[PDB]
Amino acid sequence: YSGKQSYLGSIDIDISFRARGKAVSTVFDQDELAKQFVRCYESQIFSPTQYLIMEFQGHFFDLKIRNVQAIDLGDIEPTSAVATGIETKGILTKQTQINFFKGRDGLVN
């Protein structure tokens, strides 16, 4: 389907608390979140607006992929425009740049 853009270059994830009463002031390491994401889900296909439930140190979070950038192997620079359309899909890799943003609730620190 994609032809060349088969990998995920940059992925943006909005993080929210599944339960409002479970808000924790704990400092979340984005690198650890990305490491857990790669460790638990490898070689999976994801699309924009797709939802996921993540269990990090016993804490349950709702993750929504707000946007995705698809790149082909051998592209030194990510000249491809970041697409918010659900058409674009990619394969997760151990080098994808994961950017975490506050969820619409804005409770995750």
């Binding site: 940059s10 950038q69 425009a81 970041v82």
Partner: protein
């Protein structure tokens, strides 16, 4: 001051020249000039409006305000007391031509 001591200012800018160019600037407009120059230098990376995600470590790891930024900034901030030298400058818009020598004599006088 901090801009210079954090190796964030190019080696091209000459402050004496700038102090000479800003003729009637008061004390509160040099700050505006610095802010405008910084905004100009920043806008070359983020590209606000055309497309985001261009913010990456490489682009922001070598930020340096050059001299062209200040000259461009000189078109945004304008004095408030030096509003009558511009009119004098617009009265000789047609240009001076020395079609004879009497002109030179009167100028010398």
């Amino acid at each position: 001051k901090k801009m210079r001591e954090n190796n964030m200012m190019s080696d091209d800018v000459n402050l004496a020249e700038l102090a000479a160019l800003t003729k009637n600037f008061s004390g509160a407009e040099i700050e505006g000039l610095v802010k405008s120059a910084s905004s100009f230098a920043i806008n070359k990376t983020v590209n606000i409006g055309k497309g985001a995600t261009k913010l990456n470590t490489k682009d922001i790891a070598k930020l340096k305000v050059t001299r062209e930024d200040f000259l461009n900034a000189l078109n945004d901030v304008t004095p408030a007391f030096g509003i009558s030298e511009e009119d004098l400058k617009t009265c000789v818009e047609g240009g001076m031509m020395l079609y004879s020598e009497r002109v030179n004599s009167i100028l010398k006088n």
